[PDB]
Structure formats: C-alpha cells, structure tokens
Amino acid sequence: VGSLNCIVAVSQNMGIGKNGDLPWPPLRNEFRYFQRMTTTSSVEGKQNLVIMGKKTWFSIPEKNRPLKGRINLVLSRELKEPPQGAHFLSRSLDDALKLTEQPELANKVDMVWIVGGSSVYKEAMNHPGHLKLFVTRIMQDFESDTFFPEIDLEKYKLLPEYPGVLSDVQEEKGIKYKFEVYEKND
Ligand SMILES: NC(=O)C1=CN([C@@H]2O[C@H](COP(=O)(O)OP(=O)(O)OC[C@H]3O[C@@H](n4cnc5c(N)ncnc54)[C@H](OP(=O)(O)O)[C@@H]3O)[C@@H](O)[C@H]2O)C=CC1
C-alpha cells in the first residue's frame, strides 16, 4: 500500500449529496480533477484503489461504473457479492484496508482513495496514521441531504500547496470553487 486519502467536493454548508446525486449542477473540470487524482499512480505497474459506500456506487451513472483505471471496492453489510461491475466487497473499512494486505492486492495497490459517502469518510478521518483529505470547497450553500463530517483542525492542517493541485479560485457554471489539501499524522 502507498497511502490513505479521502477526496470530496463539499458546499459551504457541508453538503455532498442530495437525492442520490450531487447538490449542484455538473462542474466538468471538478469531475476531471476527481478522475485525475484518483487514477494517477506514481508507482510503476500498480493502480489505485477507490473505496466507496453502496449508495455512492449507485450514484455513478452505469456507463461510468466501475470508475475506469481504478480498482473499485464497495462497502456493504447487506450485499452478498460486489454490485454488478464492481471488483470487491467489504463489510467494514478495517476489512477493506486488511484486504489490501492480501496476496491478490498487496503488490497491485498504490494509493487508497476514499471517495464517499459520509460514514466512510467519518471513519477514515478518525483512522490513526498519516491521512490526507483532498477537499473541493464549492463556495455557495446548496440544499443537501448528505454531509461531510467535521474536519478536526487540531489534527488536520491545511497545506499551502500540493503538486498537481491548482491553488487559485476556479469558476464553472457561475459557481466558484477552490481545491484544498489537508494532512494529519497521528
Ligand atoms: N460530493 C462528493 O464528493 C460526493 C458525493 N456523494 C453523494 O453522496 C450521496 C451518497 O452518500 P451516502 O448516503 O453517505 O452513502 P454511502 O455511499 O456511504 O452508502 C451507504 C451504504 O454504504 C454501506 N456502508 C457505508 N459505510 C460502510 C461501512 N463503513 N461498512 C460497511 N458498509 C458501509 C452501507 O451499505 P448496507 O446498508 O448495504 O450495509 C450503507 O447503507 C449521494 O447523494 C452521492 O451522490 C458521494 C460521494 C462523494
């Protein structure tokens, strides 16, 4: 394993989802950023693993599942096999992270990316160890029914810079947004 990361886009009121989709209209360059960050692996011959909950998997349009060029793992205690198109299934986050140590993954996985939803983020964010959060701040309030867990700034430090992460305010479809990276080591 090459490390543990969360990536999310969040409104000003901490919203991430509404009725099975994002709260805001599609931001193409935000999606392009998500796909680049999650897919890009520096270790030759390895790929990244994306871990997501069951509702997040079904929120991706079927033509775009699995997320291409990544190993897709879904968390569910109800499902008996990965949902159709997905690669692995785990009943907990610890199980998923143990799975990466097993022979079928131990030499394949470079970065692990938690791509949502809320319960997955909350647990990962309180997981010991070095962890980065890649947060897109959507700089407006949007009505939401799913929210990002609190970021404890006593442990997570906002970085001044990060390679491959544009620093400046961005705007698509009249909506301003900014890419941030946070890091903890505990
Ligand atoms: N803005 C963004 O960056 C993102 C937005 N989204 C949006 O967020 C919403 C989906 O989020 P949310 O409702 O939080 O759903 P999740 O994706 O977290 O799905 C929840 C289901 O996942 C399973 N689950 C979650 N955590 C675990 C776990 N730790 N161990 C075992 N199973 C687990 C359970 O399945 P079971 O009941 O089968 O046990 C649970 O019912 C959607 O609206 C989606 O569009 C999603 C990701 C990112």
Ligand SMILES: CN(c1ccc(OC(F)(F)F)cc1)c1ccc2nc(N)nc(N)c2n1
């Ligand atoms: C929910 N999800 C998602 C939804 C739909 C998709 O279909 C596709 F790929 F566009 F075809 C792909 C990814 C997203 C979408 C944008 C996201 N942004 C950031 N910064 N962080 C996340 N975790 C996130 N996750």
